[PDB]
Specification:
Helices cover 51% and strands 0% of the residues. It is mainly alpha-helical and 129 residues long.
């Protein structure tokens, strides 16, 4: 909270290690997102509206996410935060750890928050086909 851990160092002291993490995270998300004919090229912006996060969660936990539970084409800040916080709910419904990120932070393009989410998922699902 005021406690830095190893993951924080990627955004100041070790930019080289941030490059490795990013490449790895893209490799990982595309492994699952391509199954729905989707692709991420920009980690900095493409998870910010919640859509890919929700679908990624559906794919990871083999959960079929119904479209009235979220916003496939969000049109507002409220709809984006709904999506992200919903994705967090799917995580909790599966018994996963709550992310050290506020849904709003992801919508507001906070890279540290965005990447920590994906890295936590990557840590859990690294080996999943």
């Amino acid at each position: 909270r005021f406690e830095r851990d190893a993951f924080d160092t990627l955004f100041d002291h070790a930019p080289d290690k941030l490059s490795v993490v990013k490449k790895s995270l893209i490799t990982f998300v595309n492994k699952h997102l391509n199954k729905l004919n989707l692709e991420v090229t920009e980690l900095e912006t493409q998870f910010a509206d919640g859509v890919y996060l929700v679908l990624l969660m559906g794919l990871l936990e083999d959960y079929f996410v119904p479209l009235h539970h979220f916003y496939l084409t969000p049109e507002s800040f409220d709809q984006k935060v709904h999506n992200v916080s919903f994705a967090f709910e799917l995580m909790l419904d599966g018994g996963l750890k709550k992310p050290k990120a506020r849904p709003e932070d992801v919508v507001n393009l906070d890279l540290k928050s965005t990447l920590r989410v994906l890295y936590n998922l990557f840590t859990k699902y690294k080996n999943v086909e």
